[PDB]
Structure formats: structure tokens, C-alpha cells
Design an enzyme around this catalytic site. Structure first.
Site, PDB file in Angstrom:
ATOM      1  N   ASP A 126       0.702  -1.250   0.061  1.00  0.00           N
ATOM      2  CA  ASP A 126       0.031  -0.200   0.090  1.00  0.00           C
ATOM      3  C   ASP A 126       0.821   1.441   0.028  1.00  0.00           C
ATOM      4  O   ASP A 126       1.385   1.916   0.944  1.00  0.00           O
ATOM      5  CB  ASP A 126      -1.163   0.081   1.056  1.00  0.00           C
ATOM      6  CG  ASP A 126      -1.788   0.897   1.056  1.00  0.00           C
ATOM      7  OD1 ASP A 126      -1.957   1.995   0.170  1.00  0.00           O
ATOM      8  OD2 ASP A 126      -2.737   1.022   2.142  1.00  0.00           O
ATOM      9  N   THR A 127       0.995   1.821  -1.256  1.00  0.00           N
ATOM     10  CA  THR A 127       1.948   2.962  -1.235  1.00  0.00           C
ATOM     11  C   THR A 127       1.222   4.175  -0.848  1.00  0.00           C
ATOM     12  O   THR A 127       1.614   5.240  -0.463  1.00  0.00           O
ATOM     13  CB  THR A 127       2.041   3.502  -2.814  1.00  0.00           C
ATOM     14  OG1 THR A 127       0.758   3.333  -3.647  1.00  0.00           O
ATOM     15  CG2 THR A 127       2.859   2.179  -3.456  1.00  0.00           C
ATOM     16  N   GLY A 128      -0.037   4.261  -0.394  1.00  0.00           N
ATOM     17  CA  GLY A 128      -0.986   5.216   0.156  1.00  0.00           C
ATOM     18  C   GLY A 128      -0.849   5.279   1.829  1.00  0.00           C
ATOM     19  O   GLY A 128      -1.477   6.097   2.318  1.00  0.00           O
TER      20      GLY A 128
HETATM   21  C1  017 Z   1      -6.468   6.513   2.845  1.00  0.00           C
HETATM   22  C2  017 Z   1      -4.937   6.833   2.694  1.00  0.00           C
HETATM   23  C3  017 Z   1      -4.588   8.325   3.037  1.00  0.00           C
HETATM   24  C4  017 Z   1      -4.471   5.926   4.120  1.00  0.00           C
HETATM   25  N1  017 Z   1      -4.905   4.457   3.925  1.00  0.00           N
HETATM   26  C5  017 Z   1      -4.251   3.605   3.059  1.00  0.00           C
HETATM   27  C6  017 Z   1      -5.207   3.040   2.052  1.00  0.00           C
HETATM   28  O1  017 Z   1      -4.486   2.484   1.026  1.00  0.00           O
HETATM   29  C7  017 Z   1      -6.164   2.425   2.354  1.00  0.00           C
HETATM   30  C8  017 Z   1      -5.925   0.752   2.734  1.00  0.00           C
HETATM   31  C9  017 Z   1      -7.167   0.167   3.025  1.00  0.00           C
HETATM   32  C10 017 Z   1      -7.538  -0.853   2.527  1.00  0.00           C
HETATM   33  C11 017 Z   1      -8.811  -1.657   2.791  1.00  0.00           C
HETATM   34  C12 017 Z   1      -9.560  -1.435   3.929  1.00  0.00           C
HETATM   35  C13 017 Z   1      -9.302  -0.343   4.749  1.00  0.00           C
HETATM   36  C14 017 Z   1      -7.831   0.207   4.544  1.00  0.00           C
HETATM   37  N2  017 Z   1      -7.184   2.288   1.525  1.00  0.00           N
HETATM   38  C15 017 Z   1      -8.328   2.691   1.245  1.00  0.00           C
HETATM   39  O2  017 Z   1      -8.936   3.339   2.309  1.00  0.00           O
HETATM   40  O3  017 Z   1      -9.180   2.646   0.076  1.00  0.00           O
HETATM   41  C16 017 Z   1     -10.678   3.068  -0.032  1.00  0.00           C
HETATM   42  C17 017 Z   1     -10.961   3.468  -1.436  1.00  0.00           C
HETATM   43  O4  017 Z   1     -10.828   2.196  -2.184  1.00  0.00           O
HETATM   44  C18 017 Z   1     -11.285   1.307  -1.464  1.00  0.00           C
HETATM   45  O5  017 Z   1     -10.509  -0.022  -1.642  1.00  0.00           O
HETATM   46  C19 017 Z   1      -9.827  -0.293  -0.186  1.00  0.00           C
HETATM   47  C20 017 Z   1     -10.934   0.524   0.802  1.00  0.00           C
HETATM   48  C21 017 Z   1     -11.430   1.479  -0.180  1.00  0.00           C
HETATM   49  S1  017 Z   1      -5.243   4.081   5.593  1.00  0.00           S
HETATM   50  O6  017 Z   1      -5.724   2.432   5.436  1.00  0.00           O
HETATM   51  O7  017 Z   1      -6.205   4.716   6.211  1.00  0.00           O
HETATM   52  C22 017 Z   1      -3.791   3.989   6.509  1.00  0.00           C
HETATM   53  C23 017 Z   1      -3.562   5.195   7.398  1.00  0.00           C
HETATM   54  C24 017 Z   1      -2.252   5.297   8.094  1.00  0.00           C
HETATM   55  C25 017 Z   1      -1.257   4.209   8.071  1.00  0.00           C
HETATM   56  N3  017 Z   1      -0.138   4.298   8.994  1.00  0.00           N
HETATM   57  C26 017 Z   1      -1.526   3.077   7.496  1.00  0.00           C
HETATM   58  C27 017 Z   1      -2.607   2.910   6.561  1.00  0.00           C
END
Ligand code: 017
Ligand code: CL
Ligand code: CL
Lengths: 99, 99
Positions: A25-27
Site C-alpha cells: 500500500d503506497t498510500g
Molecule cells: C487513505 C490513505 C490516506 C491511508 N490509508 C491507506 C489506503 O491505501 C487504504 C488501505 C485500506 C484498504 C482496505 C481497507 C481499509 C484500508 N485504502 C483505502 O482506504 O481505500 C478505500 C478506497 O478504495 C477502497 O478499496 C480499499 C478500501 C477503499 S489507511 O488504510 O487509512 C492507513 C493510514 C495510516 C497508516 N499508517 C496505514 C494505513
């Protein structure tokens, strides 16, 4: 490896002796794993994303094997819906985004 | 380009004539942008991230430039903390993960 993004980029990791699946996860700034025990000291942290914040335990100097590549760094443990390998460890395995 | 992950992989996007910054996010299935106006009709969607679910507005076939590459596809609008480019548009610009 070169990983296309047609599907979620899931890989096998080993942490704490345990084999798990995790998302590259690059995000994500930091690595966040579902609840498990890890050795050593920890301290509390809040991390935020879409949906708001969760409370996690921060463990430092943890070794993870990611897709067969060894990395060390901070691992957050808490009620994440998915195990996420974030940039803090992606850098250590030399991962890049290319287009 | 080859983008390393020591810093957040932020790029310039252009949507509706406006430049914005967005995070290239391999952990996002979907592209999600902070509230703005987009043309046409929208459909409801719920997306689930780290601290829970949010309601967003789903707009289809939106023209968006990402780091100088054209994409045309689905954009979700809602209270995300940062603009995120997800796999639906990362595949359109040809991005892969490499290590
Ligand atoms: C939203 C970003 C700024 C940060 N996120 C990483 C992100 O890649 C998450 C990672 C993620 C993935 C699955 C479930 C929860 C979180 N993905 C996400 O929220 O994607 C949403 C939009 O597309 C969908 O597909 C995935 C869920 C939806 S995060 O999960 O909140 C996060 C925040 C801080 C840290 N240290 C680690 C992770
Ligand atoms: Cl670290
Ligand atoms: Cl490097």
C-alpha cells in the site's frame, strides 16, 4: 517482481513467526497489521484514514519478510480491516511505482 | 517515471480545469477526491477504510489528468482526508509496482 494493479497487490508476509497475507500500500505511511502479539515494548498511537481513526500499538524494530525480502521497521498493530504494508517497509525492499 | 516511496507519492492531477494534488495509492480499489463539483448524475456508494465506512458520490466516465497521463473513469467524491488515485485509474496510466 513487477506487479500489475488489475487486482489488489496482495503478498505473503512472515511476521512474528506467522505467515499472513498483506496489501502492498503506497498510500499508507506506516505498516498496520491485524491484532497479534509481538515482542518488546510498545506505545499507543492513533492512525487515521477514510472513516476516521483507530488506536494501535506501535512496535519498533520488527522484522518482516515480505514476498521473500527481509525488512525491519515499525509495525502498528490494531483493528485494521486488512493487513497493510506501508511505505516505511516498502522502501526497504526497494519498491517503486513505475508508469 | 520511477517513484520511490521515501516520501508520499503525491502527483498533480487536473479535473474540471482545476489542478489538485493526489496520492497514488495501490491500497485503494477506488479513486476518491475531496468534495468538488462534477458534471452529470451520481450513484451511491459506500467505501470502507481504516476507521470505518463513508458514503460517497460515484461519478462515472470523468476526465482526469494524472501526472500528465489522461484517464477517463470512475471518481468517488466524499470526505476523504486526502485525494487518492486508486487502482481503477492507476491501471489506465500504466502503473505497476516493482521490486
Ligand atoms: C487513505 C490513505 C490516506 C491511508 N490509508 C491507506 C489506503 O491505501 C487504504 C488501505 C485500506 C484498504 C482496505 C481497507 C481499509 C484500508 N485504502 C483505502 O482506504 O481505500 C478505500 C478506497 O478504495 C477502497 O478499496 C480499499 C478500501 C477503499 S489507511 O488504510 O487509512 C492507513 C493510514 C495510516 C497508516 N499508517 C496505514 C494505513
Ligand atoms: Cl520504520
Ligand atoms: Cl532507493
Amino acid at each position: 517482481p513487477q506487479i500489475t494493479l488489475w487486482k489488489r497487490p496482495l503478498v505473503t508476509i512472515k511476521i512474528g513467526g506467522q505467515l499472513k497475507e498483506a496489501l502492498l500500500d503506497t498510500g499508507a505511511d506506516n505498516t498496520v497489521i491485524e491484532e497479534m502479539s509481538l515482542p518488546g515494548r510498545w506505545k499507543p498511537k492513533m492512525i487515521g484514514g477514510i472513516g476516521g481513526f483507530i488506536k494501535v500499538r506501535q512496535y519498533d524494530q520488527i522484522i518482516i519478510e515480505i514476498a521473500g525480502h527481509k525488512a525491519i521497521g515499525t509495525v502498528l498493530v490494531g483493528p485494521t480491516p486488512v493487513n497493510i504494508i506501508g511505505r516505511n517497509l516498502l522502501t526497504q525492499i526497494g519498491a517503486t511505482l513505475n508508469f
